[PDB]
Structures are given as C-alpha cells and as structure tokens.
Design a protein around this ligand. Structure first.
Ligand SMILES: [Zn+2]
Length: 184
DNA sequence: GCCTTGCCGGGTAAGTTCCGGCGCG
DNA sequence: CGCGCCGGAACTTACCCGGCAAGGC
C-alpha cells in the first residue's frame, strides 16, 4: 500500500532525525514501547505531524493514543505501542531496500528534522555516518551531488552537504515541489 | 567577481530513561 | 502474575546556526 509506506518513510525520517524508538523495561516486570518525535514548534507537531501519525495509526489498526507532552524545552509526540514500535524498527532495518517513493519521503523527513532550514546552504547533520552514506547514494542516483564530512569534531557529528549546483533539483524534487529553491 | 564549500565555536532544541500509575488475560 | 499502555519530567548533548576563509571557474 503505497499510500502509507510513503508517509511511514517520512515519519521515520522525523523519528530518526528528531526523536527515537524506545524499548523500556520497567520493574514489574513491566515494559513499554515508544515511537517518539520531539519538536519545539507546537503547531508543527499538532497540525502536520500528529495528523500524519494518526492516519498511519488508524490504518494499521493501532489502538494506542497520540500523546503530546509539553516538556520544558520541547514538545513530544509519543505513541506508546509495541505494534507501532516494531513497525518502525523493522522498517528501519530494511532501509536499504527502500524504493524511490520512500527515499524521497525519508529524505524530506530527515531534512525537516535535521536540515539547514534557511536553505542558503543545503546541509543535513547526524552522528550516524552510515545513515548519511545511504542518503548520499540515493541522492547520487537521483542526480543530486553531495559530500559527507565531519562537521563537529567535538561531538562526532557528520554533515551531508548537498551541492548548491543541484540546488533546484533537490528542493523541487525532494523537500517539496511547491517550495521555491532559492529562498528570501 | 561571484559562487561554492570545508571549518569551527555558540548554545539551544532536541533526544533518553527515569518515575508512579492503570489495564489486560 | 507477567506483560503492555498512560502521563509525566529530569537530565544530557546532538544538532543547527552562521560567520570566516580557501578555492574554483
Ligand atoms: Zn530538529
């Protein structure tokens, strides 16, 4: 179902970029499974991310609630759900097998979470070099030149720099086809 | 002349894992 | 009894930001 794979990919990019997949073991022997996306902007979390997550949930017949917790520095979209946790964890394990629909959606996701949002330059930051190397090939096989290097020597944070040469192709094909490549 | 890109410190917006509670068969 | 949802919240740091300078045509 192409539908959901795409939105799943996009959300997985947000999770990986701005959240987490958590398997907690409480004393009990209780457990919990969390799919998490955090972000400072209440409006982005309630009006764009939560509707997408809701759709996905409704469609996978997941009965958990979309929690939205107001932490001090951050809003936290949280779904407590074993089904949804593995849905994403398994999808992450098979990330190399993504198809062109998902890759674009995954990159858009990853970018909205981890990207340069001024769009003056096109940069994506992450400590997981392997993840970036994967995004790099998808970008290469899509006509978008890019390089990876260590940007933050202090915290081991790599950057994937997208060439301003392929600027338009990137913004127009991957971020959003209604977004103008060269910002104010 | 203009553009692109690697560097690198600032400091915040993310991330991670505790807790106490309740529900399910 | 043995697990899985809920609602938080403390605590840590991984991003992002943005200026600078080398270098490419
Ligand atoms: Zn972010």
């Amino acid at each position: 179902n192409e539908n959901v794979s795409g939105i799943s990919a996009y959300l997985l990019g947000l999770i990986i970029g701005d959240g987490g997949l958590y398997k907690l073991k409480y004393k009990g022997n209780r457990s919990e499974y969390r799919v998490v996306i955090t972000q400072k902007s209440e409006n982005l979390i309630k009006q764009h991310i939560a509707p997408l997550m809701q759709f996905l949930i409704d469609e996978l017949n997941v009965k958990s609630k979309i929690q939205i917790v107001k932490g001090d520095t951050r809003y936290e979209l949280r779904v407590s759900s074993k089904k949804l946790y593995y849905y994403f964890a398994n999808m992450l394990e098979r990330i190399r097998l993504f198809n062109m629909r998902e890759q674009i959606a995954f990159i858009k996701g990853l970018y909205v979470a981890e990207g340069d949002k001024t769009l003056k330059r096109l940069r994506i930051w992450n400590k997981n070099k392997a993840l970036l190397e994967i995004v790099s090939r998808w970008l290469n096989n899509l006509g978008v030149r890019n390089t990876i290097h260590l940007d933050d020597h202090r915290h081991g944070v790599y950057v994937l720099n997208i060439s301003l040469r392929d600027r338009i192709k990137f913004v127009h094909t991957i971020l959003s086809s209604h977004l103008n490549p060269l910002p104010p």
